Structure formats: C-alpha cells, structure tokens
Amino acid sequence: FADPVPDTATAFDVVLSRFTDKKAPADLLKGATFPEAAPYTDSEVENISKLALSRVKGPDAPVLSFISVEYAAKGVDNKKNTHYDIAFMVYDQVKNFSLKLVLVAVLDAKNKLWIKKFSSFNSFTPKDKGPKGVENIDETPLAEFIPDFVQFSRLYKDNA
Amino acid sequence: MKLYTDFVFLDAPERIRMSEIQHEYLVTQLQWQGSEPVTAPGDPNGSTNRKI
Amino acid sequence: AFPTENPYKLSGDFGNSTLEPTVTAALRILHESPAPFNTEFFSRKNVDFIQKKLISETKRYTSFDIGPQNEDELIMMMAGIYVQDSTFDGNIKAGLRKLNTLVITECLKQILPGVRAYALYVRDASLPFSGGGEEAFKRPELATLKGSKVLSGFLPLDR
Amino acid sequence: PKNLQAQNFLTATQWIGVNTQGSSLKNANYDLRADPIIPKADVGPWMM
Amino acid sequence: QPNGSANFTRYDSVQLQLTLNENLASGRVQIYAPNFNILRIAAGMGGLAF
Amino acid sequence: FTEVKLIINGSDRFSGRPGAYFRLVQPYEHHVRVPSKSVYVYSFALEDADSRQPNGSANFTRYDSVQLQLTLNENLASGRVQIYAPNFNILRIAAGMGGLAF
Amino acid sequence: TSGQTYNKTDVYVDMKELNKPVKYVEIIAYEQGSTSFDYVDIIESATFYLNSDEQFKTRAGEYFSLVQPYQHFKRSDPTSNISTFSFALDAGSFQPN
Amino acid sequence: PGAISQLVSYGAQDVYLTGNPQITFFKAVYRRYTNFAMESIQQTFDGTTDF
Amino acid sequence: PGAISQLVSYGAQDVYLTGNPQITFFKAVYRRYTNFAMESIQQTFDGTTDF
C-alpha cells in the first residue's frame, strides 16, 4: 500500500513517509474503482487530519500541532472505501513555523484509518523545471561557434 | 489616490509549477537609524569629531 | 564525376626538377643558412609525411578522399609557421614534433571546412536552386482567423 | 563528390610577411647574408 | 546580482566617524544601509529568513 | 485623385501610382473599353471583364482589414466616393431549393 | 454624407489590419495640415480593447506619456509628446521578451 | 478579459517564441563568488610632488 | 587592399583573439520564453487617503 518516499526527498518528507502505511489493510479493498463525492460535511475532515497527526510519536519526530484544513476532498466507492485527499496546516511548536501537509488516507467499513500519503505540499525537490532563466533581458548570449568537423580540442589532442 | 499594480499572468505550465514548487528569492531591504546631533554648530554644545 | 588529377597552373610544382631543392627555396625566404633543424623540416621526407598525414587525417575525420595539396601553399605555410614558431634548444626531434604539429593543425583548419564548402558548392553548382521543392519555394503563411470559418450562406434540407 | 584528388584546399595567405613573433622588425633583410639560428629554450620568467 | 557585501550580523560594534564642517546647523544624519536577505516562500506562506 | 493606393493588412498592395494610371491604364489592360471619363479602377484579375472565366481574385474575406488611400486634388468639392467590388460566389441549387453560398 | 465635419470627443484607432506579435505600440498626435515634426498631447485618457473586452483599467494620458515608458528608453517629455504601451517587460531588447 | 484572455488566444507565430520554453523572465537567477573585500589603501611617493 | 589585407594577415599576436574561435558575432540568437501577459489592475485603499 502507499508509496516509497521518492529517492530524492527532504528529511522532513522522509520522516513523514516513515509514518505512512506501506502495508495493505486486509488488502480486500480492490473491489471498486473511484469514489462518489456528495458530502457537505466539514468537521469530519478536521478529525482525519488530527488522527494522521496522532500517528506521529517518534523519538525524533517534531512536535506537530493542528491548525486547519482546506480542500477537504472526500467521496466513497460502493465497497465503503472512503477516500480522502486533505490539505492542512500544522504548527511546529519548537522551531516556530507552520507547513501545509497533504494527507491521502482511506477508511474501511469499520472506520479504521490507513494513510496512503503523508507529505509536504511542495514537491519536485530536484528543481528540474524546464525553463532556466536569465539574469539580464537585454543581453543576448553570444552564439556558439559551430566548429569544423573535429571540434578543435580533439584536433590538438590527435595532433600529438 | 489610486494604486495600480501590474500583475503578471502565466500560462498553465508555469502557474502549476509556481504553486507546487517552493521558491527562495535573493532580495534586498533597507535598514536605517536616525540621529539628530547638534552637528558642530557655532553653538558651543557641539564638536567636529562626531561618531554615530 | 570528378577529375582525380589537376591540370595545375604550374604542373610538377615541387619534385621533378634538379635545379634547386625544396630546402634551399625555404631557406631563401627564411633568410637562414642550412642547419639540421632547417634541413630536416623542409626535407622531402618531412613534406611527404605532412602530405600523407593530411590526406589520412582528412579521410579519418571526413568521408572524403583528397589528394596531395598545392605544395606552393604548403611550403609557404611551413615557412610561415616556422618563422612564427621555431623553438628548440638543439633537440631537433622535439622541435620538429611541435613544428609539424602546428603545420598539420593549421592545414586541417583550412582543409576540413574547405571540403565541407566544396561539397556544398558542387551541390548547388550542378542543379537549379538547392533541389529543394516546397521547402525552398515556400510562400509565407497568413495564420490569422479572419475567415477560418466560412459562413456558408445557407444549409439546405436533406431530401 | 568523394574522389577529390584534383582539389587543392590549402591557401597560405595569412602567412606571407610573417615575423618571428608579433613585433615590427621591418622584416626586410637589411643584412645581406646568412643570419644563423638563435637557440631557444622555452624558459620564460627567468632564463636560467 | 550581488557583487559583494559586509556581513554586519557578526560585527561586535560599528561606528561611523564623521569630521564635520564648522558652518553647519543642527539636524539629522539619516543613514541607510541597503542589504541582502533571503525570502523563502513555500506551502502558500512567505517569510524572511535571518 | 492625384494618387491612389490600396493597403492590405497594413502593407502597400502595390506601389502608389498616379490617378491617371487607374483611369486610363488599368482599363486598357483589363477591360473592354477605357471610360475616358473620371472613372478609376484596379484589378486583382488578369485581363478580365467577367470573361465567363475567373483569372485571379482577391480574397477580401481573409484580409484582416483593408483601407484605401486617396490623395485628393486641391480643387475638389466635398461629396461622395463610391467604391464597388464585383466578386465571386456560388449559386447553390438543390432539391427544389435555392440560395447563394459564400 | 452631406460633407459636414464634426469633432470627435472619443476617437479610437482600429488595429484590425495588424496581424503580428507586437512588442509595443507608439502613439503620437499632430495637426492634419502641418504634416511635419513636433508632436502634441491631446489625450486625456486611453484604454485598450481586444474583441470588445477591456484589457486594463482606463488610464490618464499622462500615465501613457510619463509612466509607461519606464519599461524602455526615453521616459521623458522635454519637447516630446510621444506615448507608448508595451506588451513586454522591455521594448529595446533583441530578445522577444 | 484582461491578461487571462490574452493567454487563451493562440497564434501560429507562438510556436517560435513561447513553444517549448527555454528560459523564463520571472525566476531570478544568480551566481556565487569567493568572498572578497575591497579597501582603498594610500601609496607613497618617491620624489617631489609639485609642478 | 581593402579590408582583405586586414582579414588575411591577422598576424601572430592576434592568435589569442581569433584562434580556435569559440563564439560568432554574426549569428543572432534568442531563447524561447514562458508565455505570459501583463494587466494593469487598480487596487483600493482601506482607510482615508488624506494628509
């Protein structure tokens, strides 16, 4: 169940992953595809985030205090697998700051909670965005001289 | 008195990256201190050697 | 298609004559007396080495077969590079190694784009234009939407 | 066009009027004689 | 692009010594010091990093 | 008109030329009769006067905007300049029904 | 139709013939008869439409003359009354900003 | 309307200017330097310094 | 004669300037950027805007 932390991740996200459920529940919840969403329920989502924070009690775990939820996305399939995709704010009471966490978790018919994802809102640690960026707009980088066949540097290397 | 702000609107590929990827900008700010010395007046309350 | 033997302005430019050796001609323009460094560098064996080295390296870098190069231009280049750089402490082999290296590199710097330039020349000298069709004879595109949808005047009924 | 044995690509045009290094020597051979070769060890900052 | 700076955060004490003229009136000496910092923005939040 | 020039999508369609070109020369080249009278024309067709056969046309539908410049003489009275533009369309008759297709 | 001429309180320029990516536009006014140099500022405000949609809140003529040019060169009006509007961060750069 | 409309509309010329972007103009970039400090230091004269 | 004499006899010292060329001054290039558009939008004040 769930995913391994991406090979490239911050320490904060590796700890959050350490606390996810990588093992299937009864591995019975395979029966139907995608949820139906018609809830106008609010306070229920606050409790799911609180429960995910109630799961973090590591000897090296940050103190995590609940703030609030947005994008409380819920729906349930017809096998009573309740899917949540929750974005919420948490306060670090020791280092003085708040982050947004992403919680993707499910309930079974017995309302036991398993966490599929627990991570920082921000992603793409490597910062491989296509665009590179320019320090000057009115600067045109000088055009690469396309060399003759040998590329010069190999020509002096071959010629002793 | 009106305030006009020039907003930049990006296409979808960048707008998505701007939200999902964190940013660290190298920016400038001002700092200052005020001081009102007598400033070597003809008046005998000052001196020309002043440190702030 | 192409001739393999050039009806030179001057045929039998170096070699095929007994009146003066190549070395002496080089020494005059150098204004230098014979010395082991001069007599080896401008020797027939060294010029032959250079000509064969240029032919082999060009064929290795390119797909083209070239013959020996205009010797008048090569000997002037040899002497020119020689004057600009003739550094040795008496170690003739080390000096010739560096000096021959400069001649081979300067020569290839002209031969390599020269071959590319020629191949493109004969490409255009043989046929009208580049041979390109719609790629060359491409009128500009409008690509505006004033009339991309023609308002057909009416739609008849199906009968 | 691969059999280019009649072509002659070298053009030693940049090498006519060359001096020993970039100086103005009035190249002209003022000395109507032999001018023997000066040995040159490539030792720069301090000759020896 | 920065091309150098003086890091005041590690200085024990800094004073500006001004040798004054003798035809001055009293008043203010307003000293500015433009400086660099890092603005970190993540998870919808921004802030200045010291 | 002392000079007439057509502008298509902001560019000159042709180099501007004297009004006499448009009054005398153009009709000579493309029409049956040269009007003699102060009539100015410009063709986008080659040697046509309908001809019962098209031979060149300007697709104004695909021009983003057109304006025409008239350099007026100095002694003219105020008044109208009508501009006419004969064009091609397709008469489409089918199943007892008529109408003109653009 | 009768040949009478009336002054326009509101005058607009139809940029319908322009079909290209535009870096910037430049606006002048001058006397119809004096077809010569030395331009005049007769504009109290201006706004820009695309297909009848406003692109920005109407701005005073002084904005277009004095402020907008900051993006590029010659943001001044000593004798000039040339105003601009840019679609790019800079106009001068070769780069298609 | 506004800039949002401008982004939706598409022209063919765009494929040569904004297609497959290579750089952006709104992501500040800079390089790093070995720390250095400047000081203006007086030099001495050997000889008389007058007209 | 002409600029050819300058072009051809570039000389020994100039090898540091024109040898093994790295860039060309004769090929104009530009980079493709990220599509954007600008809109000037009026903001309002909260509070009296007076002296």
From Swiss-Prot, chain A:
Main location: virion
Lineage: Viruses, Varidnaviria, Bamfordvirae, Nucleocytoviricota, Megaviricetes
Gene Ontology CC: viral capsid
Protein's recorded name: Minor capsid protein P6
Alphabetized UniProt keyword annotations: Capsid protein, Late protein, Virion
Domain notes: The hydrophobic region might anchor the protein in the underlying inner membrane.
Subunit structure: Interacts with the major capsid protein.
Protein induction: Expressed in the late phase of the viral replicative cycle.
Disulfide bridge positions per record: none
Organism: Paramecium bursaria Chlorella virus 1 (PBCV-1)
Subcellular location: Virion
Top-level division of the source organism's lineage: Viruses
Gene: A203R
Biological role stated in the UniProt entry: One of the minor capsid proteins that constitute a network internal to the major capsid proteins and outside the lipid membrane. The minor capsid proteins glue and stabilize the capsomers.
Swiss-Prot record, chain C:
Signal peptide annotation: none
Protein name, as recorded: Minor capsid protein P8
Pfam annotation, one family: P8_CR
Keyword annotations: Capsid protein, Late protein, Virion
Function: One of the minor capsid proteins that constitute a network internal to the major capsid proteins and outside the lipid membrane. The minor capsid proteins glue and stabilize the capsomers.
Up-regulation conditions: Expressed in the late phase of the viral replicative cycle.
Complex and partners: Interacts with the major capsid protein.
First-listed, main subcellular location of the protein, grouped into a coarse class: virion
UniProtKB/Swiss-Prot annotation, chain D:
Induction: Expressed in the late phase of the viral replicative cycle.
Cellular location(s): Virion
Domain of life where this protein originates: Viruses
SS bonds (residue pairs): none
Quaternary context: Interacts with the major capsid protein.
Role played: One of the minor capsid proteins that constitute a network internal to the major capsid proteins and outside the lipid membrane. The minor capsid proteins glue and stabilize the capsomers. the p11 zip protein binds together the neighboring symmetrons.
Domains (record comment): The hydrophobic region might anchor the protein in the underlying inner membrane.
Protein name in UniProt: Minor capsid protein P11
Originating gene: A352L
